Design a protein around this nucleic acid. Structure first.
Ligand SMILES: [Zn+2]
Ligand SMILES: [Zn+2]
Lengths: 98, 44, 49, 304, 49, 115, 69
RNA sequence: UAAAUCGAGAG
């Protein structure tokens, strides 16, 4: 129950949705939001912290159609993982040359 | 020995009904000594 | 919520309660500052339930 | 059509120097979001080892026991966080600590006056014995099955010269310390980094030639290692902007008001990362990116 | 620079470890309580007993 | 924050009437739970964490022949910093009756503290 | 009272540079800035943690109740 | 368990 779908903020077909994730902050939210806004099928994406003291993070994903916003979130997460992989590889290969 | 004079710092003990006095000097104030017991804390 | 002295009626309003999880102080939004004529340099105020 | 291959094509890692206590490098052609994420995960989410539970058996020193235990908790430990698992707060405190996740330290230091203290000297070193309690006094006591695996690496503080307390004859300090694994967002003592911060690479644009003595003056308005002079025409140029803290002392002069512009590069981050002592700064950075990847992967695997 | 004060370290830490045996440093601090000490010491001692 | 409270058992006698209350645990029956804080002298162990409602001294009383214990009347849990067993300068071997217990409470900066 | 283990702002361990700072100010004639720099304290946040410490515990250690005065 | 008088403070 790390991430939940806010049924009271979503759309019927899934072309627009809101997600609430626990134990997260700006750090993951900004990375995921930038990465998913790089996806061309997503119209409006954003991150919002309800209250700073609470450890909650809401991600708003409104697509343009043709793909459910759940899948847009999955693709954004995948691209974040791949970006982390490439930075790890680049840093490792360049640390040895020095 | 569970008590310490507040003047000459010499350790002492007290018997039941006995006077509150340091044996080796004229003082009647006795700090309670700190004995070996578990006390927990948290470094926060 | 009221903050003595109550120089006018608007100084004793009714708020909806949000149960914050953390600290022991009445946390209040900025807008009501002129309404209670309050600051946050240790001003004290009372909540009646 | 931004894609991971395109980012890989533009992204590259440059390094200025390296050490076991300070790594200064560059991440270029990367978005501010990811640089911020690496900075923040380095500061906060990297596991480390520091003193959590401090059992006291006696403390007759002048320091109140809470402050002493807090000082012990602040003491960095030269132990790799990877050697031990995590604690289970939900289990009873009797079995919460095990040989795999709890490291037991001790401190039994008693002060006694030294008779051979020379007359007419105020030095606390000659007068008293065990007067000062230091971090190296935090004797490591392996438990259970960890007498083998920790034999190669003695659990010693990253700094053994840390002055914990000060004793006097008669006084004493005896305690045990269960230190465990925790992230730096829980408490700053668990942090593994002295400071891990980036800065946007400065960019100096000399809009007009400032040739002449003015260039000599213009060079003086920056640190030594940035501004140089041409040979033939005495004209200033930028050599290495990485050696210019943004002082903006040139704008203080009316003469060079409209001859220079100063800004930052959009995606040229200079990272300076100083390790606490438990791990190398490079391992801190790698652990940060790996934990971010694991975080995203776990989130992806979460059934919404 | 002219307005140069100084942390009197090695003068303060030393005075911490071994207090003076001759006369209390900071004479200005003693004179702060002149109205009280110098007055109670006027009812017994001084001229005329 | 250091706070000192003076526990006195000589409040209810005068004109040399006998001491009806003796510091410590009497010969009657008491629950052993009180041994968390009190020593065999009916005094708090130095450096113990004292909550509210925990005993801080035990006096066996002659008037009832039942062991009665005083409690900690404060909200902030404290640590027993020090104890002073004040004696009386009287020719008689008058028993210990006045105690000065000083506790420390950790005032970590919370939100709302004036700086 | 006693030297803090770490600098509050950044987090760098300055719990071992106290006696060294005293020595470098006393054994060798050094200005405060020179001694602080030679110990590895360039950020003013770390510099103020040792520059302005009083080390009051010395004055606290005279009043030992466990030793005859 | 009170209640007064004097003093110290917060806004
Ligand atoms: Zn004595
Ligand atoms: Zn610092």
């Amino acid at each position: 129950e790390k991430i939940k779908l806010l049924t009271q903020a979503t759309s019927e077909d899934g072309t627009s949705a809101s997600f609430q994730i626990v134990e997260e902050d700006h750090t993951l939210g900004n990375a995921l939001r930038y990465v998913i806004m790089k996806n061309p099928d997503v119209e409006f994406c954003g991150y919002s912290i309800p209250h700073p003291s609470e450890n909650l993070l809401n991600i708003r994903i409104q697509t343009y159609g043709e793909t459910t916003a759940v899948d847009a979130l999955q693709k954004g997460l995948k691209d974040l993982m791949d970006l982390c992989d490439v930075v790890e590889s680049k840093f490792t290969e360049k640390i040895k040359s020095m | 020995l569970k008590y310490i004079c507040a003047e000459c710092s010499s350790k002492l003990s007290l018997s039941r009904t006995d006077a509150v006095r340091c044996k080796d000097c004229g003082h009647r104030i006795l700090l309670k000594a700190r004995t070996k017991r578990l006390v927990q804390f948290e470094a926060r | 919520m009221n903050r003595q002295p109550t120089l006018h009626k608007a100084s004793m309003m009714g708020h909806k309660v949000r149960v914050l999880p953390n600290e022991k102080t009445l946390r209040l939004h900025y807008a009501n500052t002129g309404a209670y004529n309050a600051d946050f340099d240790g001003d004290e105020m009372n909540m009646h339930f | 059509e931004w894609n991971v291959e395109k980012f890989k094509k533009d992204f590259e890692v440059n390094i200025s120097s390296l050490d076991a206590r300070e790594a200064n490098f560059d991440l270029i052609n990367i978005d501010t979001s990811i640089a911020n994420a690496f900075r923040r995960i380095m500061i906060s989410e990297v596991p480390s080892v520091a003193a959590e539970y401090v059992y006291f058996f006696n403390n007759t020193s002048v320091i109140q026991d809470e402050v002493l235990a807090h000082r012990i908790g602040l003491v960095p430990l030269k132990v790799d966080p990877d050697m031990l698992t995590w604690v289970d707060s939900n289990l009873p405190d009797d079995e919460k600590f095990t040989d795999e996740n709890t490291i037991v330290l001790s401190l039994n230091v008693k002060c006694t006056r030294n008779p051979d203290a020379p007359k007419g000297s105020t030095d606390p070193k000659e007068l008293y014995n065990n007067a000062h309690v230091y971090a190296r006094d935090l004797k490591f006591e392996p438990q259970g099955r960890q007498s083998t695996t920790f034999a190669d690496c003695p659990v010693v503080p990253a700094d053994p010269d840390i002055l914990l307390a000060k004793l006097r004859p008669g006084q004493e300090i005896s305690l045990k310390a269960h230190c465990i694994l925790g992230i730096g967002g829980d408490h700053a003592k668990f942090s593994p980094v002295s400071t891990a911060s980036y800065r946007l690479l400065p960019q100096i644009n000399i809009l007009q030639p400032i040739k002449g003595e003015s260039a000599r003056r213009f060079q003086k308005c920056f640190p030594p290692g940035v501004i140089g002079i041409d040979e033939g025409s005495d004209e200033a140029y930028v050599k290495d902007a990485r050696k210019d803290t943004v002082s903006r002392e040139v704008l203080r002069y009316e003469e060079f008001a409209d001859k220079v512009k100063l800004g930052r590069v959009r995606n040229h981050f200079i990272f300076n990362v100083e390790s606490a002592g438990a791990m190398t700064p490079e391992e801190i950075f790698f652990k940060s990116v790996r934990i971010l990847k694991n975080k995203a992967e776990y989130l992806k695997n979460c059934p919404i | 620079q002219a307005r140069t004060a100084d942390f009197r370290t090695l003068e303060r830490e030393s005075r911490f470890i071994n207090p003076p045996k001759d006369k209390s440093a900071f004479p200005l601090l003693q004179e702060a309580v002149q109205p009280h000490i110098g007055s109670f010491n006027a009812l017994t001692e001084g001229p005329d007993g | 924050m250091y706070k000192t409270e003076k526990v006195d058992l000589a409040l209810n006698r005068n004109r040399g009437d006998p001491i009806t209350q003796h510091f410590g645990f009497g010969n009657d029956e008491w629950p052993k739970e009180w041994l968390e804080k009190l020593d065999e002298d009916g005094l708090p162990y130095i450096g113990t964490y004292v909550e509210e409602g925990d005993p801080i001294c035990a006096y066996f009383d002659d008037t009832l022949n039942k062991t009665k214990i005083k409690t900690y009347h404060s909200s902030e849990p404290a640590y027993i910093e020090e104890v002073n067993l004040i004696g009386d300068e009287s020719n008689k071997f008058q028993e210990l009756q006045t105690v000065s217990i000083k506790y420390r409470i950790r005032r970590t900066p919370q939100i709302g503290d004036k700086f | 009272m006693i030297v803090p283990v770490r600098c509050f702002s950044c987090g760098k361990v300055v719990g071992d540079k106290w006696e060294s700072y005293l020595n470098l100010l006393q054994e060798d004639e050094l200005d405060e800035g020179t001694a602080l720099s030679r110990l590895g304290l360039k950020r003013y946040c770390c510099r103020r943690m040792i520059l302005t410490h009083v080390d009051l515990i010395e004055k606290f250690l005279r009043y030992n109740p466990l030793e005859k005065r």
